[PDB]
Amino acid sequence: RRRSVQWCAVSQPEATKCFQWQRNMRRVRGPPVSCIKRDSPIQCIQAIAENRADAVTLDGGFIYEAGLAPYKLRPVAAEVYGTERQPRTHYYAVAVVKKGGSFQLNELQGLKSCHTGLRRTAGWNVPIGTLRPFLNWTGPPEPIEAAVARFFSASCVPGADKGQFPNLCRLCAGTGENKCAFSSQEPYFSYSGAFKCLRDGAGDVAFIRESTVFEDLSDEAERDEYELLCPDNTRKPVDKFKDCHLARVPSHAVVARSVNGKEDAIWNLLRQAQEKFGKDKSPKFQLFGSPSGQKDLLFKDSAIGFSRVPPRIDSGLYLGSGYFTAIQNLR
Amino acid sequence: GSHMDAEEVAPQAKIAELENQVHRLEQELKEIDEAPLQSKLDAKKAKLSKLEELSDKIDELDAEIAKLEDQLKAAEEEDYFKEGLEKTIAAKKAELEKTEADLKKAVNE
Ligand SMILES: *[C@@H]1O[C@H](CO)[C@@H](O)[C@H](O)[C@H]1NC(C)=O
Numbered sequence: 004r005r006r007s008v009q010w011c012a013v014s015q016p017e018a019t020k021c022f023q024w025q026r027n028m029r030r031v032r033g034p035p036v037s038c039i040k041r042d043s044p045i046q047c048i049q050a051i052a053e054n055r056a057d058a059v060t061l062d063g064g065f066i067y068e069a070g071l072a073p074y075k076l077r078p079v080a081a082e083v084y085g086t087e088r089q090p091r092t093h094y095y096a097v098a099v100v101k102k103g104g105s106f107q108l109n110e111l112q113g114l115k116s117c118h119t120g121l122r123r124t125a126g127w128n129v130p131i132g133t134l135r136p137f138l139n140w141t142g143p144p145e146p147i148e149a150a151v152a153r154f155f156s157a158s159c160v161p162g163a164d165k166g167q168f169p170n171l172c173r174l175c176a177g178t179g180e181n182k183c184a185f186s187s188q189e190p191y192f193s194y195s196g197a198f199k200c201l202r203d204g205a206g207d208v209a210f211i212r213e214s215t216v217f218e219d220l221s222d223e224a225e226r227d228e229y230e231l232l233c234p235d236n237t238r239k240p241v242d243k244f245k246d247c248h249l250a251r252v253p254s255h256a257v258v259a260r261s262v263n264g265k266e267d268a269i270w271n272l273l274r275q276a277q278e279k280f281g282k283d284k285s286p287k288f289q290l291f292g293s294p295s296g297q298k299d300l301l302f303k304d305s306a307i308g309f310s311r312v313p314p315r316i317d318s319g320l321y322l323g324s325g326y327f328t329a330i331q332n333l334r
Numbered sequence: 335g336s337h338m339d340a341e342e343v344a345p346q347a348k349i350a351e352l353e354n355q356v357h358r359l360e361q362e363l364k365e366i367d368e369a370p371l372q373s374k375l376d377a378k379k380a381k382l383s384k385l386e387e388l389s390d391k392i393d394e395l396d397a398e399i400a401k402l403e404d405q406l407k408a409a410e411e412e413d414y415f416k417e418g419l420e421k422t423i424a425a426k427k428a429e430l431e432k433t434e435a436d437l438k439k440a441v442n443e
Pocket residue numbers: 137138139150153154
């Protein structure tokens with residue numbers, strides 16, 4: 004196995020961008036990156052743990068996952084969102100509803116929900132953490148997926164077990180065996196997909212990140228047609244997300260092994276790839292951009308750079324006391 | 335469905351698909367222990383090893399060439415040391431050009 008930095012792609016389209024990243028890094032005399040192909044973040048986590056890959060960008064839900072045994076991976080570099088002059092290392096998980104109705108955060112029982120995917124931050128860990136006191140959940144031998152399936156009348160939760168929990172997959176738009184899939188094959192997957200599940204009239208509430216509604220809808224008059232649910236059981240316009248979110252959580256991060264993780268090499272690659280292929284840096288290639296019809300390949304599209312994670316910080320410390328306690332509490 | 339063959343046939347892509355095949359093989363070789371696939375595995379693993387050693391060398395040389403060109407680009411200061419650099423840059427480049435051809439060839443094996 005080569006001594007350079009090997010990146011983990013969770014899908015064919017991701018691999019293609021990653022191939023391009025390699026071609027471009029080599030053309031401009033910078034640090035090399037190659038690509039390893041897997042089908043899910045879990046598989047990428049296992050790959051890095053087992054010394055078949057070195058690096059992948061995970062959502063908070065999977066950073067937590069990758070911190071456990073036998074993996075023990077740590078965040079090495081965080082995504083930086085926002086704008087060059089006002090940069091953010093956190094994001095708000097919100098609940099997005101259609102303007103017109105009058106149901107509040109405490110009146111969600113028997114309504115239809117959209118989620119980014121199972122065990123993700125804004126789409127599962129925050130909403131389900133928030134709603135748990137309504138779910139009437141008993142614990143093992145009952146999985147939490149059952150109580151949620153009783154709670155909402157129907158939902159899309161990509162990656163949910165379709166066998167035992169068909170009611171969490173009902174709402175999904177995937178064709179055949181790609182229904183409820185944890186990938187782009189499912190049109191309602193991730194931030195962008197979950198909002199589409201609401202837009203099409205298929206759902207009633209979308210559990211996503213604060214910036215999604217601004218990314219997908221360019222016209223202000225269209226955005227005036229949507230609202231957020233505040234946890235004080237009030238509705239507010241979408242641009243009032245600071246006063247109306249469900250959690251503030253740290254951004255997605257690249258993870259690597261706790262020991263022999265190639266940490267220096269990864270950061271050297273990311274710093275150097277950012278200066279050469281970050282925001283407005285090059286017409287030839289974009290590290291933080293995806294072709295049409297693809298979303299957030301390798302890194303968040305609206306990401307503007309990276310921020311190094313200080314040495315003595317593991318996954319638990321990265322996610323912060325509040326969210327880290329909350330996940331454990333949810334399980 | 336659809337695809338462009340030149341993209342799928344470049345060495346970067348062939349190596350990546352090969353290591354995926356190795357992964358799938360030893361995964362379906364776990365699913366079983368809970369034998370002729372082992373011989374198939376052993377070959378792909380051997381073939382993958384040869385393709386990795388070459389790529390690592392291509393990585394190695396690019397860095398070596400990069401440092402040398404910078405050493406050289408500092409040209410004000412003797413002249414024979416300079417030529418010594420020029421010679422070495424050229425040599426490594428001819429080596430790079432052979433190792434990449436060694437790869438394009440090995441990648442159908
Ligand atoms: C949980 O209990 C409340 C109050 O008894 C009830 O209104 C609600 O229908 C229950 N929720 C579920 C999961 O059925």
